[PDB]
Design a protein around this nucleic acid. Structure first.
Lengths: 91, 334, 240, 159
RNA sequence: GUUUGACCUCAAAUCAGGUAGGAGUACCCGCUGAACUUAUAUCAAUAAGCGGAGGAAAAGAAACCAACCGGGAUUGC
RNA sequence: GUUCUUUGUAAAGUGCCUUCGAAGAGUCGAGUUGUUUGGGAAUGCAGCUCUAAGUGGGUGGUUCCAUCUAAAGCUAA
RNA sequence: AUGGUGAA
């Protein structure tokens, strides 16, 4: 019988701030315009640069077909970083 | 402020338990003395102390060589509840709906996560069930408005009470779990979000006059288990929800039936899948570079057509969505 | 290394002798049955036993129609060293590692091998949903020397590997495995069978009790008939 | 040094013999409070809506064990080697020898208590055993005798 | 197993449930305790001091009293 | 008095027949050094070398008999 | 004598 009762039917305090949500997407389409396809020279710089101090966490690519879209194993790391930031934000 | 070690000593609780309590209460830092002092009155601390006492007693019993006593102790034990902690952090339902973004993201990420030593298969199954319930509710209400297939995944946006909450779902491909991420911290968020989503789903079902939790179609659960297999029993706003009304589509093997079926159901169409085998369709969703069937009774289309139609609500002509030709560029809907 | 006591050696020897006798008897009976000299044997017709949750036992005969089966290692008996006769069969299916599982085609020629390796593994017929979930959750592709066993990630990799038989995506492999396709044998061998995670996967106060309970339940759910005409035991693999 | 009666203890059984004895004793663990309570509740429930044989358990009470000895009913007696009031157990080995009841000295009273659901058991003895373990009981008795009376025949000598 | 848990012991908690201090003191129960006063004896196992409860306190149902036809807890006259 | 409950092969008492049948140790006592009494058998109390048996031991009178069972405790008059 | 008080 759990979760069988309505609970309703908070950050206004000056010393409390709400958790800011992440911004929208940054044009990471699986089939984006060729302009978003970063050049190899700039892609090399993106790869070489350190982590967590990068403009983007991804390299947009022009995939021929939807069925050719690969997986994304870095989503776990991004979610872990978001979880860390949620409880490690000195508001 | 009081140092983290000072706060832990004042709470005389384990570091992992202290982190769990901080995550549950949303405390942030080097923490304010008043907040830590108030947190000491939470019943969760008493539950953690009871858990520690039970753990030591069970270790004693097991070492002594009495399995029956340990089994009896485990059976009588009960887990703590987060029902009341939710209300204080989210006094109003709209706040919970607004915050549901991270909860949905984490639940969907964990649903596709393969079973591992860190997380038992029961948690993954519960997350998958919660995701199925949420998807069924969204499809019934036809609240999907924005679809953006990306490298990270497909960015969904459900207009639950007009809050247009944006959530992401990763692909179904296997994921190589990195060792950098600590699942212990993520598990607390998983549990909190699971409880919050359970409560929110119950509230939504009650508001919509639907019995919760609905059962799952067994015959479908042996073939196309997922969103479609979760049948719901009770007892327009935008053109997007009205597109493909009374339409039947044939999804090919290559296409992600799981992603397409949800969108088709939300719009109001019907899905017939070849994989389910392992007739009266106006369109067939195929991704083969070249197809040999070529039946005039079916209008072959690509998923980009449905994506663009949902994003813009246009029902755009299929002049640039035939098989074997490049699709138009896909842009961010926001 | 650590000193080895006599009790363990004696127990291992006795268990190995019992297993060898069982295997010899089963092989002799199967060879005679294949020769059609069924005049004097305990039983001729094959039997398959299905056990499911309370527990219900169903005994059914085996027909010549091909069927899809899933086999998972069990790491048993405890004190039985795998004999050469079973070692060859396990090596052929490369299921030596514990918790490993693979898909095989059920045929008359495979029934004696399944009977021989019956105690060591648990078999059953999974549903389409279970097969799809297992394939989409875990997988391995050997990539270029080729010492890498990177997990399946891209559909284009599938095209590169096989290509010829239209296997261009994971769904093609899923269909070929679930259905009695021509490329069922080819894809299965290249699939690098899955390495399923162990059940308890933990150690501690609660973990020890859970493992003890699981071991206790295993004995009731799974049994070693050791009979010459022991039917193949099948469980609900969909639960796993 | 210590008198001959002292230092008689600490000459316990070897690893294998002690392990076998504890394994045999673990098959006759007396029902704990919860087990007995649930059995009684089940019996009451059966009686509410509408012939068992003699139960078998290990006798361990110091007074109870001493009463069992001197009547030749006991077959095996286990003696703790870490009894703080040593006088409570100094006489047990000699009394058992006089009565002829086989006896052994085991390491730790807590080990005896564990097999009887008690924090500390001074002694643990067996009176009656099932027919299945009767041969095992005789074999253990013979092994204990061989390893204690003959191996440690000087335990009662050389201060 | 270069490792875990038990038995035993020793300490901490502004933890939970509990109690002793002191006053009063005529009577009681124990320790201690002198001189005047009178020819070891005697004031005197008293005065004072110390510790402990009550409305009374101690003692109390014989390793008793008796040598009789035996009596039968202690207590006070 | 009025009643509501009784509970279960539960408990207790008497006579007969059979089989068993357990009692307090640095304790008594002796020795020695102080205290107590008007007490001749300092009994009683106090330090300490020593320290026993269970058809036994203590208390007494006569060559045997008489009484009790100490080294634990409660009890209103 | 007992019990206490003060103090170039």
């Amino acid at each position: 019988e759990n979760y069988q009762y309505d609970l309703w039917g908070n950050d206004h305090v000056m010393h409390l701030r709400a958790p800011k949500l992440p911004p929208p997407t940054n044009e990471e389409s699986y089939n984006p315009p060729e302009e978003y396809l970063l050049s190899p020279e700039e892609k090399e710089a993106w790869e070489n640069t350190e982590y967590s101090e990068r403009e983007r966490n991804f390299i947009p690519q022009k995939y021929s077909a939807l069925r050719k879209v690969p997986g994304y194993g870095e989503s776990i790391r991004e979610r872990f970083e978001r979880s860390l930031d949620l409880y490690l934000a000195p508001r | 402020f009081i140092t983290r070690s000072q706060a832990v000593r004042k709470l005389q609780v384990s570091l992992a338990d202290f982190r769990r309590l901080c995550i549950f209460k949303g405390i942030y830092p080097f923490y304010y003395a008043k907040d830590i002092q108030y947190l000491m009155h939470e019943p969760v601390l008493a539950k953690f102390r009871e858990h520690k006492t039970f753990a030591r007693k069970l270790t004693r019993a097991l070492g002594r060589g009495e399995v029956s006593s340990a089994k009896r102790l485990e059976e009588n034990r009960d887990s703590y509840t987060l029902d009341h902690i939710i209300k204080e952090r989210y006094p109003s339902f709209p706040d919970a709906i607004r915050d549901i973004d991270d909860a949905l993201n984490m639940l969907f990420l964990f649903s596709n996560l393969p079973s591992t030593n860190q997380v038992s298969s029961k948690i993954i199954n519960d997350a998958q069930k919660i995701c199925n319930q949420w998807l069924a509710y969204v499809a019934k209400e036809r609240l999907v408005r924005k679809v953006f297939v990306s490298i990270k995944g497909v960015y969904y946006q459900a207009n639950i009470k007009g809050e247009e909450v944006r959530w992401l779902v990763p692909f179904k491909f296997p994921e190589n779990i990195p060792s950098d991420v600590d699942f212990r911290i993520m598990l607390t968020f998983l549990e909190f979000y699971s409880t919050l989503l359970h409560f929110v789903l119950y509230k939504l079902y009650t508001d919509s006059g639907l019995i919760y939790p609905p059962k799952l179609d067994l015959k479908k659960d042996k073939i196309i288990s997922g969103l479609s297999s979760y049948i719901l029993e009770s007892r327009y706003d935008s053109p997007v929800a009205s597109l493909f009304s009374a339409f039947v589509f044939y999804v090919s093997r290559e296409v992600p039936i799981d992603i397409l079926e949800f969108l088709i159901l939300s719009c109001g169409g019907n899905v017939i899948s070849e994989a389910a085998m392992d007739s009266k369709v106006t369109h067939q969703i195929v991704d083969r570079p070249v197809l040999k069937n070529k039946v005039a009774g079916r209008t072959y289309i690509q998923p980009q057509w449905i994506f663009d139609c949902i994003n813009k609500g246009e029902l755009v002509p299929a002049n640039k969505y035939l098989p074997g030709e490049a699709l138009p560029p896909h842009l961010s809907p926001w | 290394n650590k000193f080895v006591r006599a009790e363990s050696i004696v127990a291992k020897t006795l268990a190995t002798s019992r297993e060898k006798e069982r295997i010899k008897r089963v092989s002799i009976l199967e060879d005679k049955k294949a020769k059609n000299e069924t005049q004097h044997i305990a039983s001729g017709k094959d039997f398959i036993l299905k056990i499911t949750e309370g527990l219900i036992r169903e005994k059914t005969t085996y027909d010549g129609k091909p069927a899809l089966l899933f086999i998972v290692r069990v790491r048993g008996p405890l004190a039985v060293n795998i004999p050469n006769k079973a070692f060859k069969i396990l090596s052929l299916l490369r299921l030596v590692e514990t918790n490993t599982g693979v898909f095989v085609k059920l045929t008359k020629n495979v029934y004696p091998l399944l009977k021989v390796i019956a105690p060591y593994v648990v078999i059953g017929k999974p549903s389409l949903s279970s097969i799809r979930s297992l394939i989409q959750k875990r997988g391995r592709i050997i990539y270029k020397a080729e010492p890498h066993e990177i997990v399946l990630n891209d559909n284009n990799i599938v095209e590169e590997q096989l290509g010829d038989h239209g296997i261009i995506c994971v769904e093609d492999i899923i269909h070929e495995i679930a259905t009695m396709g021509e490329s069922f044998s080819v894809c299965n061998f290249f699939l690098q069978p899955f390495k399923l995670n162990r059940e308890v996967s933990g150690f501690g106060s609660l973990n020890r009790l859970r493992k003890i309970k699981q071991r206790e339940a295993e004995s009731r759910t799974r049994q070693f008939s050791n009979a010459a005409t022991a039917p193949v035991i099948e469980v609900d693999i969909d639960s796993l | 040094k210590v008198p001959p009666t002292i230092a008689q203890f600490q000459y316990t059984l070897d690893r294998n013999t002690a392990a076998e004895t504890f394994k045999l004793f673990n098959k006759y663990r007396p029902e704990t409070a919860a087990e007995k309570k649930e059995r009684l509740t089940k019996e009451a429930a059966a009686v509410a809506e509408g012939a068992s044989p003699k139960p078998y358990a290990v006798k361990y009470g110091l007074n109870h064990v001493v009463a069992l000895i001197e009547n030749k009913k006991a077959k095996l007696v286990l003696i703790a080697n870490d009894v703080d009031p040593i006088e409570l157990v100094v006489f047990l080995p000699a009394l058992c020898k006089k009565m002829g009841v086989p006896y052994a000295i085991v390491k730790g009273k807590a080990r005896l208590g564990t097999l009887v659901n008690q924090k500390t058991s001074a002694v643990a003895a067996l009176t009656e055993v099932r027919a299945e373990d009767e041969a095992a009981l005789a074999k253990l008795v013979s092994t204990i005798d061989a390893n204690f009376a003959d191996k440690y025949d000087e335990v009662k000598k050389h201060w």
